[PDB]
Ligand binder design. Structure first.
Ligand SMILES: [Ca+2]
Ligand SMILES: [Ca+2]
Ligand SMILES: [Ca+2]
Ligand SMILES: [Ca+2]
Ligand SMILES: [Ca+2]
Ligand SMILES: [Ca+2]
Ligand SMILES: [Ca+2]
Ligand SMILES: [Zn+2]
Ligand SMILES: [Zn+2]
Ligand SMILES: [Zn+2]
Lengths: 319, 63
């Protein structure tokens, strides 16, 4: 039997609930692709937002449920942080009405290969129809005629850089898609890849006293709740975890909210923007200037621009 | 066998010919000119000189 709904502190922290009266993310053209261990697809607090379930493990693309299910819990938890439903049970995500493409690129261990991950990105871009730009107009993310995700969320990272992974990230960036990745968990001076690419938002982790977590790789672009994160977990349950894997979906939920609220108002999505951005004209510029500036002023190596805040980002986007 | 990712010149490279060096194709990317291939550990040098092969990269694991 299911617990009554609670709002995990991290959702409160990124100022999501005050957005939901404008949008919960449930604007038709918007999808979030979660590249992870898969998803507990019948989870009562997730089922209704899972729009597509793909797997790329071992180089072999599969839409079979045996293949797409979460055998770990890591992807179920992450996904619940973006998109657990706003109802009577369990938890609630940053964007509790957004459609999710669960793209299974990590195995039963929470570990995955670069080549499966790169296939995963291509699949997020292609969407279930297996075509990127179906009408050949150049618009992919935000084109309601295509089925590309507008957000790619990667709670994974590794120390190695390759041009095949790098070129896939340029493809997603050029497709107009916001890429979000965990900075990593080694307490290192800089982020893991792909978080470290200029096309990708590197996300670091804070705890409930707003301190940066000791394990969070430094030099992120933004930071988010990532210690003591309650979310969904198999089978049809809940668990509390820590890591930059937990911080990353908070930032992807905020992005979905921006793009969903902007589309709803303007019938187009915002451009992605740059790692440097401080304008109000791109998703990343808005994320930077509306982040809660913790530590030294402006960008710092612990928190990056600061803790992302949906309620101000969205106000700024519609401003 | 090891699994590598070959950056290719579309108009020089033949996926059917990696069999020549003991290889087979795993996945051909649609959006990037690259192909995931499985090959004998000692064929990497041969693979590197195959026609249409521009770069051979190795696979890595992420947590
Ligand atoms: Ca279940
Ligand atoms: Ca709920
Ligand atoms: Ca498509
Ligand atoms: Ca299009
Ligand atoms: Ca179009
Ligand atoms: Ca879309
Ligand atoms: Ca700061
Ligand atoms: Zn993890
Ligand atoms: Zn093989
Ligand atoms: Zn490599």
């Amino acid at each position: 039997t299911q617990p009554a709904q609670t709002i995990p502190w991290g959702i409160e922290r990124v100022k999501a609930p005050s957005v939901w009266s404008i949008t919960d993310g449930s604007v038709s053209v918007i999808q979030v692709a979660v590249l992870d261990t898969g998803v507990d697809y019948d989870h009562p607090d997730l089922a209704a937002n899972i729009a597509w379930c793909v797997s790329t493990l071992r180089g072999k693309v599969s839409t079979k449920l045996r293949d797409c299910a979460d055998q770990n819990g890591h992807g179920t938890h992450v996904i619940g942080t973006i998109a657990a439903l706003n109802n009577d049970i369990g938890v609630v995500g940053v964007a509790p009405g957004v459609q999710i493409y669960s793209v299974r690129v990590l195995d039963a261990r929470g570990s995955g290969s670069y080549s499966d991950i790169a296939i995963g990105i291509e699949q997020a871009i292609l969407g279930p129809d297996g075509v990127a730009d179906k009408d050949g107009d150049g618009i992919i993310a935000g084109d309601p005629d295509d089925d590309a995700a507008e957000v790619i969320s990667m709670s994974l990272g590794g120390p190695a850089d390759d041009s095949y992974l790098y070129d896939m990230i340029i493809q997603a960036y050029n497709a107009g898609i916001v890429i979000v990745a965990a900075s990593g968990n080694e307490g290192a001076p800089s982020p893991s890849y792909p978080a470290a690419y200029p096309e990708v938002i590197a996300v670091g982790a804070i705890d409930s006293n707003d301190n940066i977590a000791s394990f969070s790789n430094r030099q992120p672009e933004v930071s988010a709740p990532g210690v003591d994160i309650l979310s969904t977990y198999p089978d049809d349950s809940y668990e509390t975890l820590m890591g930059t894997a937990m911080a990353t979906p908070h930032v992807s939920g905020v992005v979905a909210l921006i793009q969903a609220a902007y589309y709803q108002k303007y019938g187009k999505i915002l451009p992605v923007g740059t790692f440097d951005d401080i304008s109000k004209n791109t998703v990343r510029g808005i994320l930077h200037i509306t982040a809660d500036d913790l530590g030294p002023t402006g960008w710092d190596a612990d928190y990056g621009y600061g803790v992302v805040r949906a309620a101000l980002a969205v106000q700024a986007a519609l401003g | 066998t090891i699994r590598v990712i070959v950056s290719v010149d579309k108009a020089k490279f033949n996926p059917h010919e990696v069999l020549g060096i003991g290889g087979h194709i795993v996945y051909q990317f649609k959006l990037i000119p690259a192909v995931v291939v499985d090959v004998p550990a000692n064929a990497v040098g041969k693979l590197k000189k195959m026609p249409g092969v521009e770069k051979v990269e190795f696979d890595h694991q992420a947590v």
